[PDB]
Amino acid sequence: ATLKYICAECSSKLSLSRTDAVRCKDCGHRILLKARTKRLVQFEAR
């Protein structure tokens, strides 16, 4: 059950937003990565 964000540093699916902060859960690190769609993406191999 889900993904939304990721911790640049301590590697660990977080998921949160607004009044929530912009930090973490078990590394106190202020940098976050958005995380891949599930819409599937296709490539021509050319």
Which positions lie near other proteins, rule CB under 8 A? 8, 23, 28, 30-31
DSSP string, 1-46: ----B-BTTT---B---SSS-S--SSS----B-----SS-------
CB atoms within 10 A of CB 7: 19
User: CB 7 → other proteins: shortest distance, Å?
Assistant: 13
Applying CB under 5 A, does 7 fall inside the site for Zn ion? yes
24 forms part of the interface with Zn ion (CB under 5 A): yes
Q: Is 10 annotated as a binding residue?
A: yes
Q: Is 19 annotated as a binding residue?
A: no
Q: Which residues are annotated as a binding site for Zn(2+)?
A: 7, 10, 24, 27
